[PDB]
């Protein structure tokens, strides 16, 4: 299938009460493997999947030294952006940063990502060609000109298409026994007595990995969009996922609907009735 | 592994 490595960084000003909170996490596909928290006592990058513990003490030293540099860089970013928008030293504010790479089935380079947000709105983002920027507003155009003059994108491109992909491959093969494993959803349907006349059919899918899934309802003929709802895929807490889909139906007509579950943990999809 | 170089906004 296809795979991604992504890092996420969040910096929050806590004005007067210390200097900003910094939180970093790394994911391979839908499995988190590292974290760094500037508030935690260890002051280290820490493992969060077991297969990353195959990495030696130099991995850890490096990652910790690099993530601390990230930490100060976005601390400085917070002071800078407060200028570019003329804000106040009481206001708490947020810088968000995300980057990483995607690879295809052949495990070769597909796509790369590098983008920022300020207070939850896009600031600047590297375009898919990995050569040009997308600045949301003029303030980011200021960053854009500086990043263009100092040729940020070209060095980014060497990491995203190269180093980033090299790590992902290594991670995928190191943690093969979990990361490359398929978990099929464990399906079951549920019936409720909503306004007497009416019944709710809830189709469940549980303990699957990855989180990607499709849950389609249907009648004797095709899909049933109206009167359906679809939950946000949620985490089980053990690295697997869950998601349900409901419909309201006329009493006595229940057993005529079929849920359809698509996932790569199953050869053929599964169908459910009540 | 994360980026080895950092750069300000």
């Amino acid at each position: 299938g296809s795979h991604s490595m992504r890092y996420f960084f969040t910096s929050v000003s806590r004005p007067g009460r210390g200097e900003p909170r910094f939180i970093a996490v790394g994911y391979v596909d839908d499995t988190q493997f590292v974290r760094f928290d500037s508030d935690a006592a260890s002051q280290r990058m820490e493992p969060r999947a077991p297969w990353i513990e195959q990495e030696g003490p130099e991995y850890w030293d490096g990652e910790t030294r690099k993530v601390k540099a990230h930490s100060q860089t976005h601390r400085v970013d917070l002071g800078t952006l407060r200028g570019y928008y003329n804000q106040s030293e009481a206001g708490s504010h947020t810088v968000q940063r995300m980057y990483g790479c995607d690879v295809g089935s052949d495990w070769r380079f597909l796509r790369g990502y590098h983008q920022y947000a300020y207070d939850g709105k896009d600031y600047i983002a590297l375009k898919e060609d990995l050569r040009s920027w997308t600045a949301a507003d003029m303030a980011a155009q200021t960053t854009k000109h500086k990043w263009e003059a100092a040729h940020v994108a070209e060095q980014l491109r060497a990491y995203l298409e190269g180093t980033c992909v090299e790590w992902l491959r290594r991670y995928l093969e190191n943690g093969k026994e979990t990361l490359q494993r398929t978990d099929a959803p464990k399906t079951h349907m549920t019936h409720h007595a909503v306004s007497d006349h009416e019944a709710t059919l809830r189709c469940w899918a549980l303990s699957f990995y990855p989180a990607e899934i499709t849950l389609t309802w249907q009648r004797d003929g095709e899909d049933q969009t109206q009167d359906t709802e679809l939950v946000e895929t949620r985490p089980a807490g053990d690295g697997t996922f869950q998601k349900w889909a409901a419909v309201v139906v006329p009493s006595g007509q229940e057993q005529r609907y079929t849920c359809h579950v698509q996932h790569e943990g199953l050869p053929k999809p599964l169908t459910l009735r009540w | 592994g994360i980026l080895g170089f950092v750069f300000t906004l």
Partner: T-cell receptor
Amino acid sequence: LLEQSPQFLSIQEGENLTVYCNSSSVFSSLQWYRQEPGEGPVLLVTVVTGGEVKKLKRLTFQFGDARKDSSLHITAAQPGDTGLYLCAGAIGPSNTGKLIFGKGTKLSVKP
Amino acid sequence: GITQSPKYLFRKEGQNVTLSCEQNLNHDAMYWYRQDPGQGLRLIYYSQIVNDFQKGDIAEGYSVSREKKESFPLTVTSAQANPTAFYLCASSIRSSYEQYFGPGTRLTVTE
């Protein structure tokens, strides 16, 4: 890795010379400097786009396609062009925040 | 520009000395090198961003700090075995891009 070539080059005026800078890796940017001993190196140019060509008076810098090499050309050499010429750069694949420096090509233009 | 004071520094062995390096180019990254006669630059320490720094290829005996964006002080302690050399500071707008050098400081140590 970063090697400069040749270590030394003697040229009587008016001739043209071309010194080189090469890497077993790939540069995300490459700098050329002049350095006088006992003073700080002086920045001539930065190149970034593979294949690109930049001119600075009599000097012409070129960047290889795969950004693995670079060259400095002096057309119509002068006795003021004498000195050590130093190549530096960022190694893309290295994922680091530092530049690498060469040992410098030393050029002597005879008056 | 980037300043280095003083241009000359003389000390007896054992005496810690701090070299200064200031810049108002609005650069985030700063770098220290030393150079022995007839040789090339050797990275001692560098800082990609205020409140961060990291060892170069020859950090033993040396110490730095980066409390302020503008300044990157270098201390040569009695742990460094061969401290006598030419010391060069450089800065770049972001780490791993074109560096601009300071004028350099000569340090001689005698027993």
